[PDB]
C-alpha cells in the first residue's frame, strides 16, 4: 500500500488552528474488525516517534484534546485546533491494515514575532593553536525569521573561503533559531592578521550588527 | 517501566553485513509483534518488517525494498529482538528503531507502536572511525555564552551535555556540518555572569561509533 502526506511543511502562529492530509492507495477500512487502521505519530527534533493518534480517531493516553484525528477508507485528516510551541515536529501517518506503510511526513513550523540575534565572538582556544588549528566563531543567538547573514572581515577585508555556517532546530520554548558561522584557518594564516570581525545582517535592522577582537 | 535498547549501530563498510540487537523488559515479550522503523538523516520513516507474537508461530514478513535482503529473528529467552542486514550500501545509512507492535491475542489489543527504542545510528561508508577533539569557546555583561566546538570526528553522531545534565536551559546545539569527509558541531550554554568562572562548567561530548567520552572544562584565558 502507498501512504501520502500533504503539506511537506507549513508555518502558522500560536494560537491558530491547522490540518494536515494523509491518503492512502487501499482502504484501510478492515471489514472484519469495523476500524481504520490509520495511526498519527510525532517526532520532535533528535527524539524517537510518539504515538497521538490511533484507529483514525482514537486519542493515546497522555495526549491533549486539540489534536483529533478523522477520516475513513483512503482519506484522514489530523487537526490540531490550537497550535503553541510544543508542537515543533514531523508528523507521520501509518496504515497497519496490510503490514504497515509510513506517510512522507508534515514538518510543523512556527511564525512568531521578528528578533534580533544576540552576537558573540570567539578567538581560537590554546589547547587548538597548539595542535596548529584557529576557528574563530560567531554565535547568533535567538532570532527570527531563520534567514540571516554573516559577513567576516579581516583587519579591513572581506574573508569568504574556510567559512561553514550551520543552524539549530526552532526552539521549542520561545520558536527561535540560533546559528555559528565558523572562519577556520591554521595557526599561521591566523598569527598573520590580528582584526577579526563578523557583522549580522537580518531584516530587524539595516546597518549590521559588529563584534570584533585583536589577536 | 517498558524499555527498549537497540545495539549494534556504528560504521560499516560498504558489501559488509551487520546485526542490530534490541534489548527488551517491563512486558510479556512473547505477547507482541516487534517491528523495525528505519530512517536516514531528514528523511520520512520506513517500516522494514516485522516478527509476530508466539500465538502467531512467531512468522517474519519483510517490506519490498528489504526483501532477501533484511532478516528479522527474536531471542525469547532474554528477551531480545534481533535485525541482520546483508550487503550494506550508501542508501541503508539511517537510524534504526524497535518497536513494540501489537499484541490481538492476549491482553489490551490496539493498532499502534506504543514504545520505540531510542534509536542506533548505522553510516555505510569506506571511511575511517575518528572520535571527535574538543576545543572550549570562550569570550575574547551581566550573563556570558561559554560553548563547546567539535571538530573532526566520523561518523555521525555526537550528543553533548552540560554539566552532565544538570545544565540544560540556555543549551543550543548547532547541527552537524561536512567537510573533506570530517563532521563538526558547536554547542553552547548561556549563564548568568555570577555562575561563571567561580562556579563550574563542564560539556561532555559522546561519540558513539568510538565507545568515547570526552570531558572539557571551561576556563578563563
Ligand atoms: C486472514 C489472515 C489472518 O488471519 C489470522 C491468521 O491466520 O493468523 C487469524 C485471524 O483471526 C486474525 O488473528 C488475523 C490477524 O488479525 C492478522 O493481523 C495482522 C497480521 O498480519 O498478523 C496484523 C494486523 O495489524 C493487521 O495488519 C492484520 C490485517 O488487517 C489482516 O487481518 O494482519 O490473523
Ligand atoms: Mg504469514
Known amino acids: 500500500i502507498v501512504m501520502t502526506q500533504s503539506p511537506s511543511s507549513l508555518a502558522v502562529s500560536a494560537g491558530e488552528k491547522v490540518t494536515m492530509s494523509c491518503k492512502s492507495s487501499?482502504?484501510?477500512?478492515?471489514?472484519?474488525?469495523?476500524?481504520?487502521?490509520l495511526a498519527w505519530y510525532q517526532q520532535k527534533p533528535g527524539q524517537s516517534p510518539k504515538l497521538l493518534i490511533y484507529?483514525?480517531?482514537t486519542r493515546e493516553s497522555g495526549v491533549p484534546d486539540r489534536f483529533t484525528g478523522s477520516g475513513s477508507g483512503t482519506d484522514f485528516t489530523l487537526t490540531i485546533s490550537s497550535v503553541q510551541a510544543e508542537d515543533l515536529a514531523v508528523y507521520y501517518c501509518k496504515q497497519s491494515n496490510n503490514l504497515r506503510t509510513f506517510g512522507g511526513g508534515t514538518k510543523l513550523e512556527i511564525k512568531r514575532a521578528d528578533a534580533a540575534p544576540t552576537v558573540s565572538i570567539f578567538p581560537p582556544s590554546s589547547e587548538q593553536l597548539t595542535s596548529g588549528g584557529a576557528s574563530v566563531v560567531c554565535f547568533l543567538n535567538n532570532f527570527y525569521p531563520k534567514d540571516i547573514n554573516v559577513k567576516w572581515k579581516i583587519d579591513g577585508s572581506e574573508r569568504q573561503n574556510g567559512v561553514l555556517n550551520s543552524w539549530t532546530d526552532q526552539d521549542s520554548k520561545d520558536s527561535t533559531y540560533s546559528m555559528s558561522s565558523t572562519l577556520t584557518l591554521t595557526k599561521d594564516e591566523y598569527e598573520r592578521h590580528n582584526s577579526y570581525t563578523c557583522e549580522a545582517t537580518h531584516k530587524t535592522s539595516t546597518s549590521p550588527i559588529v563584534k570584533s577582537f585583536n589577536r | 517501566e517498558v524499555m527498549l535498547v537497540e545495539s549494534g549501530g556504528g560504521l560499516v563498510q560498504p558489501g559488509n553485513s551487520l546485526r542490530l540487537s534490541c534489548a527488551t523488559s517491563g512486558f510479556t515479550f512473547t505477547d507482541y509483534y516487534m517491528s523495525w522503523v528505519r530512517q536516514p538523516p531528514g528523511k520520512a520513516l520506513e517500516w522494514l518488517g516485522f516478527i509476530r507474537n508466539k500465538a502467531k508461530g512467531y512468522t517474519t514478513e519483510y517490506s519490498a525494498s528489504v526483501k532477501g535482503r533484511f532478516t528479522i529473528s527474536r531471542d525469547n529467552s532474554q528477551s531480545i529482538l534481533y535485525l541482520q542486514m546483508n550487503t550494506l550500501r550508501a542508501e541503508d545509512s539511517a537510524t534504526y528503531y524497535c518497536?513494540?507492535?501489537?499484541?490481538?491475542?492476549?491482553?489490551?489489543?490496539?493498532?499502534?507502536?506504543?514504545?520505540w527504542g531510542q534509536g542506533t545510528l548505522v553510516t555505510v561508508s569506506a571511511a575511517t572511525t575518528t572520535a571527535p577533539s574538543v576545543y572550549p569557546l570562550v569570550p575574547g555583561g551581566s550573563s556570558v555564552t561559554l560553548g563547546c566546538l567539535v571538530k573532526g570526528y566520523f561518523p555521525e553522531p555526537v550528543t553533548v551535555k552540560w554539566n552532565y545534565g544538570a545544565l540544560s536551559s540556555g543549551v543550543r546545539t548547532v547541527s552537524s556540518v561536512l567537510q573533506s569527509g570530517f563532521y563538526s558541531l558547536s554547542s553552547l550554554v548561556t549563564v548568568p555572569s555570577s555562575t561563571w568562572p567561580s562556579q563550574t562548567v563542564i560539556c561532555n561530548v559522546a561519540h558513539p561509533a568510538s565507545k568515547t567520552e570526552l570531558i572539557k572544562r571551561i576556563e578563563p584565558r
Open positions: 484507529w483514525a480517531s
Open positions: 487501499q482502504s484501510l477500512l478492515n471489514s472484519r474488525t469495523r476500524k481504520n487502521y
Open positions: 518497536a513494540r507492535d501489537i499484541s490481538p491475542s492476549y491482553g489490551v489489543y490496539y493498532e499502534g507502536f506504543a514504545y
